[PDB]
Amino acid sequence: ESADLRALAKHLYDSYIKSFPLTKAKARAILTGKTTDKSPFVIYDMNSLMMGEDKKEVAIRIFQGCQFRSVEAVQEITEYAKSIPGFVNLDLNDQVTLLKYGVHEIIYTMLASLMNKDGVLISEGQGFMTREFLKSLRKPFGDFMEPKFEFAVKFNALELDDSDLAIFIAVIILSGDRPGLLNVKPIEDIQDNLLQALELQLKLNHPESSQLFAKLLQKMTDLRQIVTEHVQLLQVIKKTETDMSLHPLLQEIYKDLY
Amino acid sequence: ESADLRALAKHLYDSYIKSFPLTKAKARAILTGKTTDKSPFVIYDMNSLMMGEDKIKFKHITPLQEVAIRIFQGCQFRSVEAVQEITEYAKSIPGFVNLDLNDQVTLLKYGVHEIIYTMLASLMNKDGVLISEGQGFMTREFLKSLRKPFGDFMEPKFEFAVKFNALELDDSDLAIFIAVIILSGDRPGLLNVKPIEDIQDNLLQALELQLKLNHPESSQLFAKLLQKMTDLRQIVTEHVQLLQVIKKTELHPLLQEIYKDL
Ligand SMILES: O=S(=O)(Nc1ccc(Sc2nc3cc(Cl)ccc3s2)c(Cl)c1)c1ccc(C(F)(F)F)cc1Cl
Ligand SMILES: O=S(=O)(Nc1ccc(Sc2nc3cc(Cl)ccc3s2)c(Cl)c1)c1ccc(C(F)(F)F)cc1Cl
Ligand SMILES: O=S(=O)(Nc1ccc(Sc2nc3cc(Cl)ccc3s2)c(Cl)c1)c1ccc(C(F)(F)F)cc1Cl
Structure with a gap:
């Protein structure tokens, strides 16, 4: 049955490449030292953060960044999901349930x-x-x-x-x-x-x-654990930052995660 | 090697049997009713609790002196007995005793x-x-x-x-x-x-x-x-969350010293 499980791995690896633009192989190349062509700009303080503002307060803007990207991340993960054999054949409601907790x-x-x-x-x-x-x-x-x-x-x-x-x-x-x-x-x-x-x-x-x-x-x-703690942190800002505004997509994911 | 792995299993099994008298096989015999041995006293409500307290041995795992609290205490007592049994079983795992003494304490504290x-x-x-x-x-x-x-x-x-x-x-x-x-x-x-x-x-x-x-x-x-x-x-993490709810909303100092963990 190896031939089957290997062919399956082969298929998932393919969909994974087609669904996620920034693969680990690429991230590692940039993090190691290919450099020159792929060299990254670094932010380590308010100074460099500003100079790097070419690619609300600081903390809120950086947070706003993450949310937008996560939304994007959810989009890709959903796309990858429908490629897993048998996934789209399952009950629609559960497909949604698997996504809400898997994302x-x-x-x-x-x-x-x-x-x-x-x-x-x-x-x-x-x-x-x-x-x-x-x-x-x-x-x-x-x-x-x-x-x-x-x-x-x-x-x-x-x-x-x-x-x-x-x-x-x-x-x-x-x-x-x-x-x-x-x-x-x-x-x-x-x-x-x-x-x-x-x-x-x-x-x-x-x-x-x-x-x-x-x-x-x-x-x-x-x-x-990381996920639960995250959900907690979201609660704090949910009360201390009443003008935060969350993307609807993320609002649906956070629905019952607490 | 397969012969080694098969050997370690048998070894742990024999050791497990020694450390834990009430095995799962025996526990299932009693549950399914498939046993000639005396049937267990069933506690389905308060009345039966106070009732079968004698044969249930609820007096030996409880201080001189309400229900919820008292059953909880029974749990702690059985838990502590369990820890000792688990701790002796650990010794039988090849290499365990050879580890740093502190790591043994650590592995057990978080493992029990x-x-x-x-x-x-x-x-x-x-x-x-x-x-x-x-x-x-x-x-x-x-x-x-x-x-x-x-x-x-x-x-x-x-x-x-x-x-x-x-x-x-x-x-x-x-x-x-x-x-x-x-x-x-x-x-x-x-x-x-x-x-x-x-x-x-x-x-x-x-x-x-x-x-x-x-x-x-x-x-x-x-x-x-x-x-x-x-x-x-997950179950252990939630457990601690409930326990904390207890320590907050709650005694004999010396007694609490025995159950200072579980
Ligand atoms: O809890 S967070 O770690 N979430 C969070 C959410 C999305 C991204 S971006 C992000 N980029 C990618 C790229 C790929 Cl290929 C795959 C997954 C992701 S997630 C990041 Cl870096 C963090 C976080 C850290 C810091 C802040 C703030 F700076 F605002 F305080 C907020 C969050 Cl939510
Ligand atoms: O994909 S992101 O690069 N988006 C993101 C979003 C806003 C700002 S802040 C920022 N603030 C200003 C203000 C002006 Cl006036 C002009 C340009 C900018 S860019 C930054 Cl530095 C990044 C990003 C950065 C950092 C994180 C994390 F902190 F979580 F690691 C996540 C993301 Cl998604
Ligand atoms: O987290 S627990 O599931 N651990 C736990 C630990 C030992 C035993 S064994 C156990 N054996 C006996 C014997 C008698 Cl005579 C009375 C009470 C018990 S509890 C059990 Cl059943 C559960 C638990 C369940 C219920 C309570 C309480 F009833 F107090 F709410 C507390 C715990 Cl800690």
Whole structure:
């Protein structure tokens, strides 16, 4: 059945490339040292932030940035989702349910690709905001990304590439344990096919990294935690920033995440 | 090597049997009614609680002196007994005692909760849980009928158990699974993660070979099981959220010293 699980991985890797413009391979090239052609502008203080304003207050504008991009992220993830075999064939309501709870877990997973212990790529790689600058922002804004860094650091630790992430992302989506799913069996039969394909994929692409499959699935707790904490932070600004205004798409996702 | 993995499983199984008298197989015999042994006193409401208190041994796990509070205390006591059993089982996991003394303390401090509810699932069915070595059976509704916040404590655990038992795992599977949980190299404060994750790998291969041979008809049981580790961490986190609600809205100092964790 290998031929089937390998062909499946092959298909997901393909859709993943067609759905996500900024892959890990590209982010790493910019973060390592291809440079010259891909060299990023860095923001580490209010000074450079201003000089880099060519690519409300500061914290609010940076936040406004994230939301717009997440919205964009949701769009891509939705597109990738309809490519996972069996997904569009499931009950419409559950498709929506899988997306509402899968989106943030996937966003921070892929966001790890653009991070390193020191910062994160922004504006499609055009820029790079240091971890410290972000942390100096007035709270609760300065407390938004730190947990993501902690996660990204431990997660990138696995040294996964895009083809692995392709399947892993698929697995996060087809989670039968989401709140409200009407039909759980059908969703789980798909995941069993994905988890299977992931394990094989991880054993073939990383023949030296022992129990990578088991180590990867264990990162789910970190994702869930980061997501919950995020949802909390959103509440604070929801009360302290009554003129914030959230995108409707994000408003629907945050509906019951608290 | 396959012979080593098969050996480690048997070893952990024998060790598990020694550390835990009330096995899952035996627990299921009592539940399904398929046993010649005395049926457990059922606690379905207050009246029966005060009733079967004698044979239920609720006087031995409770101070000299209301219900909700008293059942909660019973839980703590059984939990502490569990910790010791888990702690002795740890010693039997190859390499465990050879680790830094601090990491052992750490692995156990953060591991016991996950393992308690995992094992507790072996004494539960959709309607309730076996108690006191099987001499009792407290129903799910009675616990849920308890006043707030106490009635919110066990419900989450039932939802988990019902899904967990669907995996139809046996004591031989559970043994390796438990060990896997204890040897988690991602616990806060570990000083030397290398040897710890090295042991988990061994336990993970042993667990996977064990699942494949004992559950051939079950695809990805291994993966599915690993996912349950996520459900457990969730259950422990919520648990703490409820506990804090207690410490805030609540005694004997010396007694609290025994139950200063669980
Ligand atoms: O909780 S956040 O970490 N969310 C958040 C949301 C979207 C993006 S952008 C972003 N870019 C990509 C690119 C790819 Cl290829 C995949 C996923 C993403 S997510 C970023 Cl960098 C952060 C966050 C950090 C800092 C702030 C602020 F600076 F405003 F305080 C707000 C948020 Cl929401
Ligand atoms: O994709 S983003 O590059 N969008 C984004 C959105 C607004 C501003 S701030 C900004 N403020 C001004 C003010 C003037 Cl008068 C002119 C130009 C600009 S650009 C910045 Cl620096 C970035 C981005 C940056 C940083 C993060 C995060 F902080 F989360 F890491 C996320 C994103 Cl999406
Ligand atoms: O998080 S818990 O699910 N852990 C937990 C820990 C040990 C046992 S065993 C247990 N054995 C006995 C025996 C007697 Cl005679 C009386 C009460 C109990 S509770 C059980 Cl059933 C649950 C829990 C459930 C319910 C309550 C309370 F009823 F107080 F609300 C508290 C906890 Cl901690």
